[PDB]
């Protein structure tokens, strides 16, 4: 259903340095053997200064629907979270609750610690068996 033309999705890659990241994209077409999906990124560009959004043909395994958006005023310590960083969604864990509705999130591969506001975060959900799953 999320494969249908024009439907908004999120896509990932397994090229090293990309595993764990989800970028927002829109479906352009799909195979009706291949089972591939043609997509256009929303914030990623083809190259350089960039006027053309990047297009890509990915296996259906690397495509999922966009997770439902929630009203979120606060996250708790050790909450598993998605952070919107460098135009991509990165999964990490809240390791410190800061003041002014801000949070420290710890990431791995490579190990890192970043500061985020509440608006840059959402709950981490994996898309498994046609269902959204929290850890």
């Amino acid at each position: 259903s999320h494969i249908a033309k024009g439907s908004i999705v999120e896509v990932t890659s397994d090229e090293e340095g990309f595993k764990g990241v989800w970028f927002e994209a829109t479906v352009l077409g799909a195979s009706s053997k291949s089972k591939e999906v043609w997509v256009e990124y929303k914030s990623i560009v083809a190259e350089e200064n960039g006027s053309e959004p990047l297009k890509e043909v990915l296996h259906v395994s690397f495509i999922r629907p966009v997770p439902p958006v929630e009203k979120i005023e606060r996250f708790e310590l050790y909450d598993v979270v998605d952070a919107f960083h460098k135009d991509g969604w990165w999964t990490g864990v809240v390791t410190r609750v800061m003041e002014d509705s801000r949070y420290q999130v710890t990431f791995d591969n490579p190990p890192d610690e970043l500061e985020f506001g509440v608006s840059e975060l959402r709950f981490h959900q994996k898309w498994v068996k046609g269902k959204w799953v929290r850890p």
Partner: peptide, 10 residues
């Protein structure tokens, strides 16, 4: 607003 490689980490 960025190429795919300036989105990658390190």
């Amino acid at each position: 607003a960025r190429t795919k490689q300036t989105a990658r980490k390190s």
